[PDB]
Structure 1
Amino acid sequence: DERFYAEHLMPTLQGLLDPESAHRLAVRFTSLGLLPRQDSDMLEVRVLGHKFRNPVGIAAGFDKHGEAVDGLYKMGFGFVEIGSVTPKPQEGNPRPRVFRLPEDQAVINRYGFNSHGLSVVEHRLRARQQKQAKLTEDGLPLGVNLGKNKTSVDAAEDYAEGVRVLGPLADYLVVNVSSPNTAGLGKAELRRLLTKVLQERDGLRRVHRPAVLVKIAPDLTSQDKEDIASVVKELGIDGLIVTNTTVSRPAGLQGALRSETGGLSGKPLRDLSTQTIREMYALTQGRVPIIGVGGVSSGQDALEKIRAGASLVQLYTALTFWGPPVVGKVKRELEALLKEQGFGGVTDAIGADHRR
């Protein structure tokens, strides 16, 4: 299957369908379990004391509305992140709003937080809440990424609503700094927002109390990164997700659509994300777990992020080019590399470039 998807089926499908139509179909195929279905003990990771069967997750934006979670576990992901979910439903930007850059192994998107909204997602997750508890117990956690509505004037209150409504259904919640596709996205205001989010989380009953992570852009200044690291440590934010898509356009992009507005993902992002992880790990003294994301398509890509300071990784864009078999490929390849490089497991490699 790995070669067949990569060389034949996915290229052919790219030809037939626009990428958004393809995404919609993929979410329906995955929700139906139209996939084949052990991970090595080497791949197990405990992050904040909680088990992950393997360190490879699906990034936010694939299953925006929580429709395909079980199918994603079936695909081999060690954890699933849904969202972003906004408090009220919203349509997002006009179509077309997703663009392939095949020559670059990249995508540009400007979805604009299209979302079924908190209530719909809440009911979807409730339908399977106990099943998720068992999965989480078995090493397959669920994350929920929270957004804000386009027309909201109080961003903190949108995020607070999301904590209250979906927090009780989540292992972890994510607050983005960092969508490029919502207008408006100092350190005192960042602190204010996060304090409110944490206070809401802290108010949930313990069985229903998620971790809270902040997801950042690759496009931050050095000052912004220092400031985030400082706030995260001061408030005791649980983790970081590093990174979202980039609004930069690195030199050398070849795709005809390179100058479309949106966030760029895939291969062109990869090393910018890895370098962001490396910086955030250093700034937080290795004490804050990082989920590393951006341009992971192989075991080497994953290990590079882990060795830079990621405890876990996610991928999305690689699926669009390689299909579902990429998940197994990344995990087999990572296991092989860890052995070659002398690591006992994933855990031993975390932050190794820094010297621990």
Structure 2
Amino acid sequence: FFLYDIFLKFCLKYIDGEICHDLFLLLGKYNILPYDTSNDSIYACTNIKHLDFINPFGVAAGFDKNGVCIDSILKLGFSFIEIGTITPRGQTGNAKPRIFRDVESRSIINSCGFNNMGCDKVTENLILFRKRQEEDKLLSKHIVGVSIGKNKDTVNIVDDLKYCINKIGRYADYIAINVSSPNTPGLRDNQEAGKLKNIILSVKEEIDNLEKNNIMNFLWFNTTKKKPLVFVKLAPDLNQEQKKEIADVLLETNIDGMIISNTTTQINDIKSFENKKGGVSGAKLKDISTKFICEMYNYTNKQIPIIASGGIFSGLDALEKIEAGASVCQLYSCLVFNGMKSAVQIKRELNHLLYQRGYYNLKEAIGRKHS
């Protein structure tokens, strides 16, 4: 458990972004990635309704787009993973190279364009994992969510989301509505109050309709054994009117949680990304995101639980997001810049910090900045 850091520093030096991405998914495919069977702190526990996370750290969407590494990635010490984003039909995505990193600022820029094997192939992989999960006592508590979007040419999102829910809904602990991507035009236009309310109610109605089509209680082949929760992933690039307008919709529609936030197209302060096009992740996104959690946690009057992402690399970064209003933390660029150690390390720092600040448990620290 050092060999990986020689590999990582070398990878970050001479190897392309997507080659590392396809290399990491290769190691976990043949299950040759390290384990973390070490028991997690009971004071570091968190939840979103019936969704009970062993620790507050999971993997963001876009890491395991196709769910070919679910068990492998979880075993690194994460409580959950968000597979996808997935679309009804598979897509090659946008032109390569399309993933670039600036080590100096710990940032990433990407124009992937929902590259996936399609909803049907990803479902095939999730059913495989859920089958492994039954036999296994270790992955019995690990949560697996699915991020759903639309094919580039889909003239109406709703139809594309109605298809994915009917296919993969049965095997997800939660569904994440992806209306925040900056690399598939113009998905962000769906963040308008009217459009978003129709999306959220259509999705929730489809989930309800799965049950209303059989006597099987057997029906839920997930971790919770309950209907998936419905979450919405939001872009940080919004004005205050747009944010308040959304808040009022999330309250009326009774959305289960909100993933604040996706990548940002506001950053122009990176030299290595000047020519490049896409959304910016990592450390340069941290300050924006924490400010956006505050705004939304105040706008939804603390009623809608939050999943934070990103710019999370340390235990302080984690506690910052939690004190702002978030219940869980998703990681992405941390896994790119710290590698395999990521979970094990971030989990140590947070327990060390939770004690240092004067907390009995994580829950007690949630939204602490608001007072």
Query: Which band: TM-score by shorter chain?
Result: over 0.9
Is residue 243 from structure 1 mapped to residue 284 from structure 2 by the alignment?
Answer: no
1:280 is aligned to 296
Please give the residue correspondences for 1:80-119 in structure 2 after superposition, counting only pairs within 5 Å. 80-119=81-120
Please give the residue correspondences for 1:248-287 in structure 2 after superposition, counting only pairs within 5 Å. 248-251=266-269, 253-254=270-271, 256-287=272-303
Match of 1:192 among 192, 198, 210: 198
Identical pairs, percent: 40
2:328 is aligned to 312
1:48 is aligned to 49
- 1:240 deviates by 0.2
Judge conservation of contact 1:143–1:173 (CA < 8 Å) in 2: yes
2:14 is aligned to 16
Is residue 73 from structure 1 mapped to residue 91 from structure 2 by the alignment?
Answer: no
Q: Quick one: structure 1 residues 136 and 121, their matched pair in 2 at CA, closer, same or farther if it must change by over 3 Å? A: farther
- Partner deviation per Cα, 1:173-215 (whole Å, 9 max, x = no partner): 1012200001011311211111111110111226532000000
- Partner deviation per Cα, 1:239-281 (whole Å, 9 max, x = no partner): 1001111011153x24x23441101000000011111111111
Helix, strand or coil at the partner of 1:51? strand
- 1:87 deviates by 0.6
2:124 is aligned to 123
Quote the Cα distance in structure 2 between the aligned partners of 1:135 and 1:278: 38
Please give the residue correspondences for 1:288-307 in structure 2 after superposition, counting only pairs within 5 Å. 288-307=304-323
Match of 1:162 among 158, 161, 164: 164
Structure 1: runs of 5+ lacking an equivalent: none
Helix, strand or coil at the partner of 1:212? strand
- Partner deviation per Cα, 1:305-346 (whole Å, 9 max, x = no partner): 000000000110111111010111111101111111111111
Q: Give the structure-2-normalised TM-score.
A: 0.91
Judge conservation of contact 2:48–2:257 (CA < 8 Å) in 1: no
- 1:36 deviates by 3.2
Helix, strand or coil at the partner of 2:8? helix
Q: Quick one: structure 1 residues 62 and 195, their matched pair in 2 at CA, closer, same or farther if it must change by over 3 Å? A: same
Quote the Cα distance in structure 1 between the aligned partners of 2:81 and 2:138: 10
2:369 is aligned to 353
- 1:132 deviates by 4.0
Quote the Cα distance in structure 2 between the aligned partners of 1:150 and 1:161: 15
1:330 is aligned to 346
Helix, strand or coil at the partner of 1:297? coil
- 1:14 deviates by 2.2
Equivalent pairs, count: 351
Note the aligned Cα RMSD (angstroms).
1.7
Match of 1:341 among 352, 357, 360: 357
Judge conservation of contact 1:58–1:77 (CA < 8 Å) in 2: yes
Range with bigger deviation, 188-197 or 64-73: 188-197
- 1:50 deviates by 2.7
1:146 is aligned to 148
User: What residue identity is the alignment partner of 1:129?
Assistant: R
Quote the Cα distance in structure 2 between the aligned partners of 1:160 and 1:132: 27
- Partner deviation per Cα, 1:72-108 (whole Å, 9 max, x = no partner): 1111111111100111011100111111112211010
User: What residue identity is the alignment partner of 1:230?
Assistant: D
- Partner deviation per Cα, 1:141-160 (whole Å, 9 max, x = no partner): 11100011001111111111
Quote the Cα distance in structure 1 between the aligned partners of 2:265 and 2:310: 13
Judge conservation of contact 1:32–1:71 (CA < 8 Å) in 2: no
Quote the Cα distance in structure 2 between the aligned partners of 1:158 and 1:136: 34
1:35 is aligned to 34
User: What residue identity is the alignment partner of 1:155?
Assistant: I
